[PDB]
Structure 1
Amino acid sequence: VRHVLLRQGVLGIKVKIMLPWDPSGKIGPKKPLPDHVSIVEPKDEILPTTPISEQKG
């Protein structure tokens, strides 16, 4: 919130800027939003239909 002094009067300036989320915390805050539910992707696994072994050592 700042003031500027023109010749006819005085004007107020309000600048509100929402900072984006970052994991590092330099460009914005570290904590994510309370509404954003970050869900990771499941890895592609192949179900084995034949029982095998991996004996080593």
Structure 2
Amino acid sequence: YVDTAVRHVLLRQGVLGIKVKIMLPWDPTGKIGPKKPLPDHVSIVEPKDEILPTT
């Protein structure tokens, strides 16, 4: 889920260390984000129906 990026920058002051980490969004289909959901983030389905009376 977390894409680590660690780079160096050389300047006249010396060096600068940068760390960038980006949590990818959960997209269930496609190349955008990962396809497994979070184990904490649990999705349910909305309610089913209504009518059910006898005949």
TM-score by length of structure 1 reads 0.78
Indicate the structure with greater strand content.
2
TM-score by length of structure 2 reads 0.80
Q: Gapped runs of 5+ residues in structure 2?
A: 1-5
Q: Gapped runs of 5+ residues in structure 1?
A: 51-57
Larger RCO (alpha carbons 8 Å, 6+ apart): 2
Q: Percent identity?
A: 98
State the aligned residue count. 50
Deviations 1:5-53, CA, capped at 9 Å, x for gaps: 0111100000000000001131100000010110110122212133xxx
Distance 2:10 2:43 in 1: 46
